[PDB]
């Protein structure tokens, strides 16, 4: 059979040499062109166990995205372990592109095609592919953006639902658009995000149904804002156009069972806690002009309080491996022979 194995994955993309955006530049040196002749092969009468929570593809993507950021997005000052480095800190063009992950000779990527798939255990519809689908390496907290939707229902996934310390990854089946803008213009660090109130509320209702299905139909489901910690995880934080946005998500995550837009206030920050490694980095003040990103919310990261009658869920995230996991969950690498 094909034992799961660690190998040198390589990346493929549609990066262009002439595009100075940072993902394109990184990809031009680090990746090959997207596969011009994809071939998925159904494996007949094969059942295969997956485990999305222990998948070395996740670690390899993690290290690639760290390298992409470290090469591309240089802070003026960085503090790690009580040591300070300073360097030139040019602003850059920043918009993620899809990257595919590919197996070299002697290895294969297996893909689980089961509709229900909870991420662990046997899969009865398995195929082999040369490369994964294209995944945008979006670094964010709380909300998963520009990812892949579930096919017919919301799916929630956790390494262990009974353990309240394990993050719940929610995959939506209908995306909710979110538009975030620092206006051209006042206060250069003031920004905001708009989304449809009825779409968001309907999304919360549908997630709650799935949480009830998992935890008990006698349960009442509550959403509440983050209990606290670093700004990065108390807010919905992301990079838009090279600037770090910290958006107050209180309105998104204050809900119980019993205008037309939600507008989230946001700030652009120069001093951030790094995701790549423990430390802090300081960037230059924002560029001038309209800074705007329109994103599809395709998933969420939640934590449950636990510790009766009611279940409170709060926005989570922070470990970007769960972001990668939210797209890599259906894949594993095996060694042929």
């Amino acid at each position: 059979v094909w034992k799961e194995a660690t190998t040198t994955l390589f990346c493929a993309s549609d990066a262009k040499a002439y595009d100075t955006e940072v993902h394109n530049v990184w990809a031009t040196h680090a990746c090959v062109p997207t596969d011009p002749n994809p071939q998925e092969v159904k494996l007949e009468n094969v059942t295969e166990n997956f485990n999305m929570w222990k998948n070395n593809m996740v670690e390899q993507m993690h290290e690639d995205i760290i390298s992409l950021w470290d090469q591309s997005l240089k802070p003026c000052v960085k503090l790690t372990g009580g040591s300070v480095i300073t360097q030139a800190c040019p602003k850059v063009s920043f918009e993620p592109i899809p990257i595919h992950y590919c197996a070299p000779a002697g290895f294969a990527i297996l893909k689980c095609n089961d509709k229900k798939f909870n991420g662990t255990g046997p899969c009865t519809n398995v195929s082999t592919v040369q490369c994964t689908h294209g995944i945008r390496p979006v670094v964010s907290t709380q909300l998963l953006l520009n990812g892949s939707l579930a096919e017919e229902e919301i799916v929630i996934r956790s390494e262990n639902f009974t353990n309240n310390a394990k993050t719940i990854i929610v995959q939506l089946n209908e995306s909710v658009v979110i538009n975030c803008t620092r206006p051209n213009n006042g206060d250069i660090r003031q920004a905001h995000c708009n989304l449809s109130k009825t779409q968001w509320e309907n999304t919360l209702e549908q997630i709650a149904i799935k949480l009830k299905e998992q935890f008990g139909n006698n349960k009442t489901i509550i959403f509440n804002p983050s209990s606290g910690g670093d700004p990065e995880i108390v807010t919905h934080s992301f990079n838009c156009g090279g600037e770090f946005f910290y958006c107050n998500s209180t309105q998104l995550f204050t809900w119980n069972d019993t205008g037309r837009n939600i507008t989230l206030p946001c700030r652009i920050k120069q001093i951030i806690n790094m995701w790549q490694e423990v430390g802090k980095a300081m960037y230059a003040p924002p560029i001038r002009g309209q800074i705007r990103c329109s994103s599809n919310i395709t998933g969420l990261l939640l934590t449950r309080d636990g510790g009766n009658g009611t279940e409170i869920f709060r926005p989570g995230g922070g470990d970007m491996r769960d972001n990668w996991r939210s797209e890599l969950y259906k894949y594993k690498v095996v060694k042929i022979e």
Partner: peptide, 27 residues
């Protein structure tokens, strides 16, 4: 993540701290 300082900060809110990757998260 800096766990001690995370716990230090969250405890002053009546919550334990734990790492979320490289970030401090209160519980």
């Amino acid at each position: 993540x800096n766990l001690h300082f995370c716990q230090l900060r969250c405890k002053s809110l009546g919550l334990l701290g734990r790492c979320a990757x490289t970030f401090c998260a209160c519980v």
